[model samples]
Target: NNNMSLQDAEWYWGDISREEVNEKLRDTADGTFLVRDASTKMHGDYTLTLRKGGNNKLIKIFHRDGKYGFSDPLTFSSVVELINHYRNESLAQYNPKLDVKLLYPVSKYQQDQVGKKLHEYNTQFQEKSREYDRLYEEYTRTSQEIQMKRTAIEAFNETIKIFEEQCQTQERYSKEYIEKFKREGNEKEIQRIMHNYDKLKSRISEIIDSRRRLEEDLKKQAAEYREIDKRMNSIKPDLIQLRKTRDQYLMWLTKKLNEWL
Candidate 1:
C-alpha cells in the first residue's frame, strides 16, 4: 500500500539480520545508514542502522496513523520523507547518544574492494603449503643418511671382530711361550713377543673407537630428522585453519559477484 519504490531505494534492505546490517555498513562513512525490517517481521517498525564514532547506532522507526517517524511527536507521510528530514537535521535533537546527520545511504550490496582480503589469504596459504612440502622432502633425505651411517657401522664391525679374535689368540699363545723360555734365559725372544702382542691390542682397540664415532654421527642426523617432522606437524593445523578462513571469504565474495551480475 505504501511506496513499492521503497524496495528500489539502495538504503532500504528487506528482511536481513542485525549482524548482516552491520557488516554491509562496516566500511562506510560516519553518517552512513541503512534501513532494515525488524528482526520480528510481525511488527511493522523498521530499524535504521547508522555508523558514527567508528561504531553502529540503531534507531527504531515506528509507523502509526499511516505516518512514520523515529519519534512519534513529529511524523512524515513516507519513510523517504522521514529520511530526507533526518539528512537536513542532526539526530542529537532526538537522542543524545547520536550526534551525526544521516548524510550517506549504505547499500545492501557492498563494493568489490573486499576481494583483496581473500587474495592475500590465498597467498599465505600457498606459502605454508610449500613450507610443509619442503619439510617432508627434507625428512626423507635425513632419515636415509642416518640409516646409511648405521648400516656402515655394523658392516665394519665384522672386520673388527676378525682382527680382535686374532690379536687375543696371539697374546694367549705368547704368554705360554714366555713361560716356556724363562728357564732357558731366552730373554731376547720373550721381549720380542711381548712388544708385538701389546701393539696388536692397540690396533684392535682403535678400531672399536671408530664405531663410537660413527654412532655419534648417526645420533646428530636422527635429531635433525625429528626436528623437521616437528616443524611439519605444527604447520599442518595452521594450513587447516587458513583453508577454512579462505573458503568463508570465498562464499561472501561469490554473493557479492551474484548481486553485481
Candidate 2:
C-alpha cells in the first residue's frame, strides 16, 4: 500500500552476486549481470554499454583491478542456455539448488572469449558494408558524368555526318565545273575542290577524338564497376565465416550470462 520504496542500493562491486538475487529484490532476470565490486575494483571511470532488443549484447568499458579491463555483455538467449547447461551439470552432481557462485566465475571467462570474437565479426561486417557503399556510390556518380560526356560524342558524330552531306551537295552543285574543268584541264578548279576536302578531313579528326575519349571513359567506368563486383564476390566466404563465428559465440555466451547474479 506504500507508494515509496527502499532507496538504498546495496553494493555488489567486483564480487559476483548470489543466486536468486533478482527474486529477492523483486526484479525479473533481464539477462544482464555485472561484477558486484566493479566500482571498488575499477582503476578509472567506465561506461557499461549494451545494444538493445533481440538478445541485447552487453559491453563493459571500465578500468578494473588496477588496470583497464572490459568484458563483453552476453545475450539473453545465450545466458539462458548457459544456465540450463550449468543446471544439468549440477543435477549430475545431485546438487538440489543450482550454485551460481560456482557458475559465474568460469562463465565470465567464456563470455569474455565470446565477446571478443563477436566484436571482430562486427568490425569486419561494418568494413565490408562501407566498401560496398563506396563502390556503389562511385559507380552511380561516374555513370551520370558519363551520360553528359556521351552527348558530346553524339554531337561529334552528327557534325561528321553533316560535313559528309554538305560535301556531296557541293559536289553536285559543281558537277558541270568539275567536268568542264577536267576537259579544259583547269588546275584552279581542282585546287578549290582539294581545299574543301581538307576542311572535311580536319572536322573528321575532331569527331574521331571526341568518340575516342567517350569510349575510353565508358570502358574505365565499366571496368571499375566490374572490379568491385568481383571483390565483393571474393569476400563471401569471409562474410559467411564471420557471421557463423559471431552467432555461435553469442549462443554460447547467452546461456552462460543469463543465470549469473
Candidate 3:
C-alpha cells in the first residue's frame, strides 16, 4: 500500500484514466527492466529500453542488438502488459527455465536442441524449394500449351480468311456467268453456274462454324493459363517465408557455435 494523496484523478490519455496511470507507475517502480530470449547467445548488448510520454505517462519499448535496433514507440497501454509479454511469451518460446538477466555458457543440451531446430528448418526449406520448382515448371508448361493453342487458332483464322477471299471471287464469277448465260439463252450453262455458286456458299458456312469452335477452345485454354499463373504466384510467398526461416535457423546456430567454440 504505497498510496500517497488523491494524485489529480482528472488526468486522461485517450481512454486511459489517471487511476490506471498511477497503477502502472507502482507496477514499474524500478524505473527500468531487462528481458532477453534464453536461446539468444550473448555476443552484443541485447538491450530493451523504455521511455515515458503523455500526462498519463505512456511507456514505449525499444530493442537493440549489435547494429540492428527498432522501437515499439508508445504502443503499449501499460508497462505491466509489456512485462507480462516478456515473461510469458518471448522468454517462454525459448528456454523458459533459464534466467532472463543472466548470460550463461552454452551447454551440450542447448547445442543439441539448436542443432535439431536448425536441421528441421533446413529440411523444410529444401521441401519448399522443390514445391516452388514444380509449380514453376507447371506454370511454364501451361504457358507453352496456351501458346500452341493460340497458334492453332491463328492457323484456323488464316484458313477462314483464305476461304472468305475464295467465296467472294466465286460470287463475282457466278454473277458474270449468269449475265452471259442469260443473254445467250443457255439454260444448261446457267444451271451449272448456279450449282457451283451454292457449293461455294456451303464451304463458307463450314469455315465460319469451324472458326467459332476454335475460338471457344481458345477461351478455355486462356482460362487454364490464368489458373496455372495464379498457382505459381501463390507458391512464391511460401517459398520466400521458408527461405527466411532457414536463414534464421542458420544464424542462430552460428551464434551458438561461436559462443561455445
- Superposing all C-alpha atoms, what RMSD in Å does each candidate have to the true structure? 12.4, 16.3, 15.5
Per residue, candidate 1 scores C-alpha lDDT tens digits across 1-261 of 335466667678677798777656666778887788887776657888888888887888878888887785756788887787788788766767657888888753554356444445445667678888899888888888877887888887897988878977886775677656766665557666667777877887777788777768777858777877787898889866666563235444333653431
**Scored by CA lDDT, what does every candidate get?**
0.73, 0.48, 0.49
Best lDDT goes to which candidate? 1
- Candidate 2 lDDT: 0.48
Better of 2 and 3 by TM-score: 3
Score candidate 3 by TM-score against the native.
0.47
Task: Name the lDDT of candidate 1.
Answer: 0.73
lDDT of 2 by residue, 1-261 (tens): 122221211212233333323222233233333323323455433322221232323334443343343342322232223334433454233233332222322222353343443444455577776765676677677667767776776887787788778778877886667666666555556766768778877877777777787768777866766776676677656655655453345443424543332
What TM-score does each of the candidates earn?
Answer: 0.46, 0.41, 0.47
Superposed Cα deviation of residue 161, candidate 3 (Å): 2.4
Best by TM-score: 3
Could you tell me which 10 consecutive residues in candidate 2 have the lowest summed lDDT? 1-10
10 residues in a row with least lDDT, candidate 3: 5-14
